[PDB]
From Swiss-Prot, chain B:
The RNAP catalytic core consists of 2 alpha, 1 beta, 1 beta' and 1 omega subunit. When a sigma factor is associated with the core the holoenzyme is formed, which can initiate transcription. The rRNA transcription and antitermination complex (rrnTAC) consists of RNAP, NusA, NusB, NusE (rpsJ), NusG, SubB, ribosomal protein S4, DNA and precursor rRNA; S4 is more flexible than other subunits. In pull-down experiments interacts with CedA. (Microbial infection) Interacts (via flap domain) with Escherichia phage lambda antitermination protein Q; this interaction renders bacterial RNAP resistant to transcription pausing and allows it to read through termination signals. This is DNA-directed RNA polymerase subunit beta. Acetylated on several lysine residues in the presence of glucose. It comes from the Bacteria. The gene is rpoB. Co-administration of salinamide and rifampicin or salinamide and myxopyronin suppresses the emergence of resistance to both antibiotics. Belongs to the RNA polymerase beta chain family. DNA-dependent RNA polymerase (RNAP) catalyzes the transcription of DNA into RNA using the four ribonucleoside triphosphates as substrates.
Swiss-Prot record, chain C:
Co-administration of salinamide and rifampicin or salinamide and myxopyronin suppresses the emergence of resistance to both antibiotics. Belongs to the RNA polymerase beta' chain family. The chain holds residues 329 to 537 of 1407 of the full protein. It comes from Escherichia coli (strain K12). DNA-dependent RNA polymerase (RNAP) catalyzes the transcription of DNA into RNA using the four ribonucleoside triphosphates as substrates. Acetylated on several lysine residues in the presence of glucose. The RNAP catalytic core consists of 2 alpha, 1 beta, 1 beta' and 1 omega subunit. When a sigma factor is associated with the core the holoenzyme is formed, which can initiate transcription. The rRNA transcription and antitermination complex (rrnTAC) consists of RNAP, NusA, NusB, NusE (rpsJ), NusG, SubB, ribosomal protein S4, DNA and precursor rRNA; S4 is more flexible than other subunits. This is DNA-directed RNA polymerase subunit beta'. Mg(2+) binds at D132, D134, D136. Coiled coil: none annotated.
UniProtKB/Swiss-Prot annotation, chain D:
It catalyses: RNA(n) + a ribonucleoside 5'-triphosphate = RNA(n+1) + diphosphate. The gene is rpoA. It comes from Escherichia coli (strain K12). This is DNA-directed RNA polymerase subunit alpha. GO terms for cellular component: cytoplasm; cytosol; cytosolic DNA-directed RNA polymerase complex; membrane; transcription elongation factor complex. DNA-dependent RNA polymerase (RNAP) catalyzes the transcription of DNA into RNA using the four ribonucleoside triphosphates as substrates. This subunit plays an important role in subunit assembly since its dimerization is the first step in the sequential assembly of subunits to form the holoenzyme. Its EC number is 2.7.7.6.
Curated annotation (Swiss-Prot), chain F:
The RNAP catalytic core consists of 2 alpha, 1 beta, 1 beta' and 1 omega subunit. When a sigma factor is associated with the core the holoenzyme is formed, which can initiate transcription. The rRNA transcription and antitermination complex (rrnTAC) consists of RNAP, NusA, NusB, NusE (rpsJ), NusG, SubB, ribosomal protein S4, DNA and precursor rRNA; S4 is more flexible than other subunits. GO terms for cellular component: cytosol; cytosolic DNA-directed RNA polymerase complex; RNA polymerase complex; transcription elongation factor complex. The chain holds residues 4 to 74 of 91 of the full protein. Its EC number is 2.7.7.6. Promotes RNA polymerase (RNAP) assembly. Latches the N- and C-terminal regions of the beta' subunit thereby facilitating its interaction with the beta and alpha subunits. Part of the processive rRNA transcription and antitermination complex (rrnTAC). The complex forms an RNA-chaperone ring around the RNA exit tunnel of RNAP. It supports rapid transcription and antitermination of rRNA operons, cotranscriptional rRNA folding, and annealing of distal rRNA regions to allow correct ribosome biogenesis. Keywords: DNA-directed RNA polymerase, Nucleotidyltransferase, Transcription, Transferase. This is DNA-directed RNA polymerase subunit omega. It catalyses: RNA(n) + a ribonucleoside 5'-triphosphate = RNA(n+1) + diphosphate. The keyword Nucleotidyltransferase applies. The keyword Nucleotide-binding does not apply.
Amino acid sequence: EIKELLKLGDLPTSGQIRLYDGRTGEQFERPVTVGYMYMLKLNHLVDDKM
Amino acid sequence: KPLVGTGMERAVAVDSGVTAVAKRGGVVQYVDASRIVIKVNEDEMYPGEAGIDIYNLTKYTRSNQNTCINQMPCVSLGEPVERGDVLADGPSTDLGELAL
Amino acid sequence: DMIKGKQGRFRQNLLGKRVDYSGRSVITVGPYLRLHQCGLPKKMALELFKPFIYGKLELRGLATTIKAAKKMVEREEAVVWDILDEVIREHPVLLNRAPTLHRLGIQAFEPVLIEGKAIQLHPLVCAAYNADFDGDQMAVHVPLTLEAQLEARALMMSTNNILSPANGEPIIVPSQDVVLGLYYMTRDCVNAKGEGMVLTGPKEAERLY
Amino acid sequence: TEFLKPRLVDIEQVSSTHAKVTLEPLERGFGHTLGNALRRILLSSMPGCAVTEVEIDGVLHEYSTKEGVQEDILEILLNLKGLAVRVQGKDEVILTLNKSGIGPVTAADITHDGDVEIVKPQHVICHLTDENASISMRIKVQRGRGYVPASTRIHSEEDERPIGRLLVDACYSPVERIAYNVEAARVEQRTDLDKLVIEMETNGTIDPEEAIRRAATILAEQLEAFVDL
Amino acid sequence: SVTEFLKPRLVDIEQVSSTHAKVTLEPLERGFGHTLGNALRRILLSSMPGCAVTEVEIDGVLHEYSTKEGVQEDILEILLNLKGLAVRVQGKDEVILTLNKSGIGPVTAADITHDGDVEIVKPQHVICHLTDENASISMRIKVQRGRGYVPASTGRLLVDACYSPVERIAYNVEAARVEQRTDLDKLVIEMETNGTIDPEEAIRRAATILAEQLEAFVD
Amino acid sequence: VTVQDAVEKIGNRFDLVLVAARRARQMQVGGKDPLVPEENDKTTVIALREIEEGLINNQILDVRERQEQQE
RNA sequence: ACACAAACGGCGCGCG
Ligand SMILES: [Mg+2]
């Protein structure tokens, strides 16, 4: 089902993409995993502990 | 909101009680980001009763862990609502969907 | 009760005690750092060396008195930072994770100053410290006297402690990421772009790649 | 010395905010070389026109409420931060927006002046939700490059910040999107001559051609330093 | 300031060897170091104009691994050995060179049949070792002027078109404090060249080439 | 600097530090200016450098102090 | 007069 959705999307069924170094503009070797993930912040930020 | 959810997002927000709920089938007429007031359908309007329900949103207030709990509206004047509908979002919520 | 047991004076006070000129921070990895170096935040550094700063200020003569010196430090003025750099120019410092496993658990470092608030550690060393960056905190202490400074530099300094004492074997063996990249580099491909040429030496090899 | 000098051979306002541009002819590998540098320079170096001030009709802090409005004050700041404008021949200016009665608000409502430019009048501003409700706010604009946090700004200013003046972070960059492609196009009726295409998305505040030429000029400044040995 | 950027007051000339001078720049606007380092790096290996040596016409040796007597190293190695040669040719776009030596001895670039309008970085460079007193070898070799570098992907032997007189470049980017902030970068560069053009002077040329391109877009 | 070499000259880790500190306080407040050149280092390093050369040593230090007492 | 500043002992929850 995920593969079909990717095809319905705009990406290869593998989900991995090539990328380029923002410093040098040259391409990284072979595709890599690129994705969208849900990320949370924990109530332990540094300034409250240092 | 969370993109890849599990299906608990609506339920948790509602039972948490941090979000406001439509106690009666009604339509909305007011907004101040501090209060919300609802005009209720006749079938739930009581014979010696106003026919309207008003709510006061809790605003910036320190939590037990020193964090604000301010509620926010998610509706507009004249907008309909079923009884039990989500009236106002709270912290980490949107449209009554749990959003950490 | 005040004497006996875990709460007794022996454990409570004598064999372990709170110490001034100390601080705790959250850890981070600085790839740019050399093995002997460590990065620490300016905020902690400014506090930690106040007695040193006052001396340099009065050696500079800029501060009429201690209170004046303290008053200037409140400014956090540029000159303060200039003096702080001079003071910290080579002063060793002590970093320890908790609970310590062994004497390798505590080692000395030379500091560099950072704008943020985390304390930066060399990746190769942290492994010996068993540091995992999932949120580990770390404590810092400064040796004051001449004797301690030489003690810290002579023994505790990281360059000295490449060998484990439980076994005369390198504890410095590279990280997961560092080793893998080299592993990938050292592997061979049966056929590849540019394969089959003759090169005079690494110099052109780097250029060709 | 066989180099043919590239030129900004064509420009395209494919959209009122999105643009295309191409450079040609380019020597071997230079397209990648220039492409990377120009991308890097544009994102960092471009000079921006951005807003950082809010003066309001009586609230005293970011967390204050407001009568007869759909949203809280702080959310207003986020919308304003999103808002962008271009200013003609000026370094800073103050703008004001006044509305009354039940209605939603848009950038067009601002007290616009001919020497100021609003890139998207349709941009959304917070709404009014009472007949007697009214808003009358004032905002200041500045020219800058890069980004600045609000706290750092006031500490640099060090003059008294009166109550009722609210602080927001400056995000100057007129543009944030870069894609560039190198292709082979025919010059010298032969192969091994390169063609470069750039495309970007903007808040509309600058002309794309000015962007590349201004950026290239900036890069020349740093490059010239290497002759100073 | 709105359209002004910090520039480096650069001081470092450390020629640990004349063939490579260590140089350093400071201060630079945040992030420019990677931009400048990458740009110059790409310029130096790819773009440099230079002369390269690529030819061998030799008796009986059809290909690089066909071999002949009188010399203690294979043709394959010899082709490698001569590639290390570096030479400056004045004006001419290509030049053809001849070598001829005999007897048990090592052979140097000095032995080359030369014009005098051409110069060697290391006349002492050795490209042969001879096995026996009767052993003697002679061949024709070519020098060609060209921009950049190419491998030998282009009855006679040929080798890479390595015009660029340089093969090393390492650039480093680390910060240094201004009186009130430490977000600015240093640039530290090391590179190595055969010495036809000593490293430092070539760097200014590298900047020159880039400047020529940007000048078209000047405002 | 990191020594890992001067210890060979004196032959002991502990003696290295002990002897070095003895010399260090001389240049710190005791006078007797550094023998090795100065590179805006600190006396701990400066004295450390002196032993790193093998220039200073305990036996020399013992000679230095006793001969100095004089009148 | 050129000088001190706000912790004693428990409980719960979390942290590596
Ligand atoms: Mg951990």
